[PDB]
């Protein structure tokens, strides 16, 4: 089934009456406004394109403005697409709200993880550090060997090395839905989700269940 686009508000706890603390992530899910419906005949597949939030009228270009005007909806801060199953249908201009998840109890949350910059092999790939003492020469956190010898004669593609870490799209699967609060546009899921505070989150019903 489709999902909704929200933003990571932060993280807190919920105390249950039987003395259990549930670490929850607070996701603010405003109304998602359908801006385009893609169908098999015209686009080759079935999906809806949604928008959410708001954007400053000076920051929206007339290409984007014209695209929004065709749907007859207000400008949002972006556009996302959701693949449609066989059953459901939607109409352009329709708004979808958080009570979509009223009876779901597992979600998959996708976001852009925090960017770690250029990271070494110890941090990025959990490589073991070498000896801190006992004669070690300038080689406390270096990767060590990277290949065999003349017989391969090259470094194998996909070798684990230092480089960019984080700042990439990550999905976390099968999160408990703790609370759906329609009037506050809030969704509370158990556990941590990728991304820093204030970043966009894509919430979908769990695919594996």
């Amino acid at each position: 089934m489709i999902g909704l686009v929200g933003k990571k508000v932060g993280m807190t706890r919920i105390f249950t009456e039987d003395g259990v603390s549930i670490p929850v992530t607070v996701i603010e899910v405003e109304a998602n406004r359908v801006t385009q419906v893609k169908d098999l005949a015209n686009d080759g597949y079935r999906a809806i394109q949604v928008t959410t939030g708001a954007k400053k009228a000076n920051r929206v270009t007339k290409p984007e403005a014209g695209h929004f005007a065709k749907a007859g909806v207000e400008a949002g801060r972006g556009l996302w697409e959701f693949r449609l199953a066989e059953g459901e249908e939607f109409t352009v201009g329709q708004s979808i709200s958080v009570e979509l998840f009223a009876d779901v109890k597992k979600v998959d949350v996708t976001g852009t993880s925090k960017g770690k910059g250029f990271a070494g092999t110890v941090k990025r790939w959990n490589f073991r550090t070498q000896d801190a003492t006992h004669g070690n020469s300038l080689s406390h956190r270096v990767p060590g060997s990277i290949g065999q010898n003349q017989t391969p004669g090259k470094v194998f593609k996909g070798k684990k090395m230092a480089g960019q870490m984080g700042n990439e799209r990550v999905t976390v699967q099968s999160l408990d839905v703790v609370r759906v609060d329609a009037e506050r546009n809030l969704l509370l899921v158990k556990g941590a989700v990728p991304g820093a505070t204030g970043s966009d989150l894509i919430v979908k019903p769990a695919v594996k269940a």
């Binding site: 706890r13 003395g19 259990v20 603390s21």
Partner: protein, 122 residues
């Protein structure tokens, strides 16, 4: 968190005074043992006329750690030292008959009812 070479105090009247963890058993490459975990130990110090001798190798259950345990609340209970209770190597039952110092709630497992009953507290 108890690992190999960790020294432990003895929380029963079996006769041992200091024991050292020989193996955190119950899995491959397993690193630590918390409260309620079973470990294999050697006896480093014992009283002259106890039921166990220095250098004996046998099992034990960890009942107090100064890393502590966490409750579902999120609270934590820490102790001032690490303590264990000696168990028979084959039948994992306590050797001693008195239990010294408080124990914690995690030992209620139908396997350590003797320790819970004999303990002074919790």
């Amino acid at each position: 968190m108890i690992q190999e070479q960790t020294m432990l105090n003895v929380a029963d009247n079996s006769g041992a005074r200091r024991v050292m963890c020989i193996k955190v058993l119950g899995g491959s490459h397993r690193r630590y043992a918390g409260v309620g975990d079973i470990i294999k130990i050697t006896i480093k110090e014992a009283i002259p006329r106890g039921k166990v001798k220095k250098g004996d190798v046998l099992k034990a259950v960890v009942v107090r750690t100064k890393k502590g345990v966490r409750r579902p609340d999120g609270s934590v209970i820490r102790f001032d030292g690490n303590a264990c209770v000696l168990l028979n190597n084959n039948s994992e039952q306590p050797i001693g008959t008195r239990i010294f110092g408080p124990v914690t709630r995690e030992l209620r497992s139908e396997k350590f009812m003797k320790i819970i009953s004999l303990a002074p507290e919790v």
